Each structure stands twice: as structure tokens, then as C-alpha cells.
């Protein structure tokens, strides 16, 4: 029942009207590396972005647009969200299921796994 909301100084609109997403970032499918999928991340909900009339740069009014936090475990992120009074959605970690790989299978005598090239 810890509540730091009064002490944080965050204005009430972002405390109440923002949904924070707790998740482990998925691997960038362009790369096979997995080092960026080992820590939980807290990200706020996306808001409106509009073009500046003068230059066309994207302007925002969301202070927490770029705020992202790293947490070792899901429970730590949940506790931080609760202590800060942010509504939170938790996406369970997705792990690659174990696979059975056999280089011999590429030359099966009767199975369809034989590779044409």
C-alpha cells in the first residue's frame, strides 16, 4: 500500500490517465542477437505527435513520451508502478522453446527432411 504519488510531483493527469506497459522487449528480428531481451522494460502509452508548422518536426505534449525504465524482474517493475500509482499491464516473458536440430536429418534416407541443396 506504498503510495509515493503525492511526493513524486507528477501532475495528476499523467498519474491517472496513463497506462504503463511492463514487458521484456522482443528481439529485433533483423538480428539474431538476444542480449537486448534479458531485462524487463517499463514503457508509457503513446500519445499524439503533430508536425511543427515552421519546420515539420514532430512535436509532442507528452512529457513521458521517451521515458523507459529497466527492471531486473517483473515483480520489481510491478512494485514500482504500484508505488507510483500508474495503471500497469504486464506482458509475460516470451522465451524461445527448445528445438531439436540434427545435421544428419538433412540427409534422411526415407524422411522428407532431406535437403535438395
Amino acid at each position: 500500500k506504498l503510495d509515493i504519488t503525492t511526493l513524486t510531483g507528477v501532475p495528476e493527469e499523467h498519474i491517472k490517465t496513463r497506462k504503463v506497459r511492463i514487458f521484456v522487449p522482443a528481439r529485433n528480428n533483423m538480428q539474431s542477437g538476444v542480449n537486448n531481451t534479458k531485462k524487463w522494460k517499463m514503457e508509457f502509452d503513446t500519445r499524439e505527435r503533430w508536425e511543427n508548422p515552421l519546420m515539420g518536426w514532430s512535436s509532442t505534449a507528452d512529457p513521458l513520451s521517451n521515458l523507459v525504465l529497466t527492471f531486473s524482474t517483473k515483480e520489481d517493475a510491478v512494485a514500482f508502478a504500484e508505488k507510483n500509482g500508474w495503471s500497469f499491464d504486464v506482458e509475460e516473458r516470451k522465451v524461445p522453446k527448445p528445438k531439436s536440430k540434427s545435421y544428419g536429418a538433412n540427409f534422411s534416407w526415407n524422411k522428407r527432411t532431406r535437403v535438395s541443396t
Partner: protein
């Protein structure tokens, strides 16, 4: 000295002759791996 006179299809024709002596081939059980 026999090798001096061999045609283009000599090897394949010899294979055709040998086809009769060949024993039955073993089968994977499927027409093709793609099958």
C-alpha cells in the same frame, strides 16, 4: 588399346546392357522426398 575406339554413348550403352544383371533396387517407401 581397346580404349582407342570408344564412342560418346559407349558408357551409357554398357550401362543399358548391365541393367539386366542388376539386382532389385531398395526403396525408401516414398516416390520422392518432396512427396
Amino acid at each position: 588399346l581397346q580404349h582407342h575406339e570408344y564412342s560418346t554413348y559407349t558408357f551409357l550403352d554398357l550401362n543399358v546392357e548391365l541393367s539386366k544383371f542388376r539386382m532389385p533396387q531398395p526403396s525408401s517407401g516414398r516416390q520422392s522426398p518432396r512427396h
